């Protein structure tokens, strides 16, 4: 644009929340599908849906994590990471069924003298591998759903051996995307790269994806967000550099069915 406008500079507004960025590398719309409400032709539950709109379809910022030379990577699941986020989480636990899309905005700035590259991946049905070699598909619900704080990748598979009282948790090795496939191919999934010399954010617009029109949000996660250091953090000459990564996520076109009393999950 001769009158100013650019790819690198965006403003996103949803509800009472606005995000600005002066160093973007465009935006990604997963599979080229923008979030939408459930159509009558595809509808299944017959009751009048709850649609929270601005009350739930706004930007929630999760806890800032920290990137260092030893970081192997981080992961989150949706809707799980947002389960305690304001009126979205409440509508989620009061209803049997729910569906949502998301705008995911990953934030990581640094300086013209730093370097490093984060791979940001949105994975549909991101089933991760467990820590056991004596039993399979055994990670516990509590261990599988970290909520907002997420989990992390490790560079080494180290099998839980306390057979008497098992850890019952994931053991996601980074070069295998925690699921037995090579990280180098995760680019077939909707993604963006935050390369510190180029951009300071990643923005992904995620449609609702599933084999059902609507499902149990408490039982099932539709999307996994995986962030892995494609190229390690490095700065000037400091042996221990650090920079923050902040995740802000907004539910989009979300609707809920099957109202009752609130679900009080055992999360510990």
């Amino acid at each position: 644009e001769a009158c100013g406008y650019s790819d690198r500079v965006l403003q996103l507004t949803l509800g009472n929340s606005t995000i600005t960025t002066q160093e973007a590398a465009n935006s990604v719309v997963a599979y080229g599908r923008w979030p939408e409400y459930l159509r009558d032709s595809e509808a299944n539950p017959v009751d009048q849906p709850t649609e929270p709109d601005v009350a739930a379809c706004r930007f929630y910022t999760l806890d800032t994590v920290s990137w260092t030379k030893e970081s192997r990577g981080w992961w989150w699941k949706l809707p799980d990471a947002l389960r305690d986020m304001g009126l979205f989480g409440q509508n989620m636990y009061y209803h049997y069924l729910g569906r949502s899309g998301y705008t995911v905005h990953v934030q990581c700035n640094a300086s013209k003298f730093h370097q490093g590259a984060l791979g940001v991946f949105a994975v549909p049905e991101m089933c991760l591998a467990g820590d056991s070699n004596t039993t399979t598909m055994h990670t516990s619900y509590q261990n599988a759903n970290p909520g907002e704080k997420g989990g992390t990748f490790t560079g080494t598979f180290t099998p839980d051996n306390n057979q008497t009282s098992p850890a019952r948790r994931f053991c996601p090795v980074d070069y295998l995307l925690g699921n037995g496939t090579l990280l180098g191919n995760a680019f077939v999934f909707p993604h963006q790269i935050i390369n510190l010399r180029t951009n300071n954010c990643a923005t992904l617009v995620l449609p609702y994806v599933n084999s059902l029109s609507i499902d149990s949000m408490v039982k099932h996660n539709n999307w996994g967000i995986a962030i892995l250091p494609l190229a390690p953090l490095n700065f000037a000459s400091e042996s221990s550099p650090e920079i923050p990564i902040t995740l802000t996520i907004a539910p989009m076109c979300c609707e809920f069915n099957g109202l009752r009393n609130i679900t009080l999950p055992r999360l510990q």
């Binding site: 590259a117 070069y175 180098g184 191919n185 680019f187 250091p229 000037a236």
Partner: protein
């Protein structure tokens, strides 16, 4: 009854056949489709997506995150290679497990143009010019910029546009190449060199990584479906 004569092939079972057969659940009420995002119609669609090359399969780096990183530095100009690669998309260890390589191991034959894109992951203050080469087969595989220069290449200038793409044009005697190491259908040599050198100011890191990606061009195809060697079930 109508006079008939059984021909050869009768009562056999070809696993690649295509006949009708009786339905075991008549009048079953099929659940309709919904419009799920991300539908695929052809395996080649997946080959056209960029995936990251494990360039450094050296003993201590292989099967780890390091294998994806080609380390560069601000060292003085040299005509020696940064990396050397054989254009054997299905058989070369560096390409064989990329998404392109993987799809190619379900087919016996491949054809078309490929493209390698390199991403510079150094700091904004780092500058440099590199040369990316492709040499069609039949001569001494390039070991020095001087040789490499004489074939198909791109001189990449590092700057705002973070990445650079080199296209490896379909240049073959045969109409299709085999998905295995084979001299008759050899494809040539990919190699990368320093054109000038990487230059950084003070207070800046002197070493950095580049990443590489491969994907197929729209003129690429595969044929003769086959089982892969990339999975097995010993017992």
């Amino acid at each position: 009854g109508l006079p008939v004569m059984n021909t050869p092939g009768s009562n056999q079972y070809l696993t690649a056949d295509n006949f009708q057969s009786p339905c075991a659940l008549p009048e079953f009420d099929v659940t309709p489709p919904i419009d799920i995002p991300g539908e695929v119609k052809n395996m080649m669609e997946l080959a056209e997506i960029d995936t990251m090359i494990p360039f450094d399969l050296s003993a201590t780096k292989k099967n780890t995150m390091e294998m994806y990183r080609v380390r560069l530095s601000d060292k003085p100009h040299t005509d020696d290679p940064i990396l050397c690669l054989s254009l054997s998309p299905a058989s070369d260890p560096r390409l064989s497990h990329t998404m392109l390589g993987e799809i190619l191991n379900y087919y016996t034959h491949w054809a078309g143009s490929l493209k390698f894109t390199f991403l510079f992951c150094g700091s904004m203050m780092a500058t440099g010019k590199l040369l990316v080469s492709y040499a069609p087969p039949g001569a001494d595989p390039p070991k020095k910029r001087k040789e490499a220069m004489l074939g198909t290449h791109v001189i990449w200038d590092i700057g705002l546009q973070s990445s650079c793409t080199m296209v490896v044009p379909w240049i073959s005697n045969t109409t299709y190449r085999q998905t295995i190491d084979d001299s008759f259908t050899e494809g040539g040599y990919i190699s990368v060199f320093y054109q000038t050198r990487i230059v950084v100011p003070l207070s800046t890191p002197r070493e950095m990584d580049i990443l590489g990606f491969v994907s197929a061009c729209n003129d690429f195809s595969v044929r003769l479906l086959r089982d892969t060697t990339h999975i097995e079930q010993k017992a």
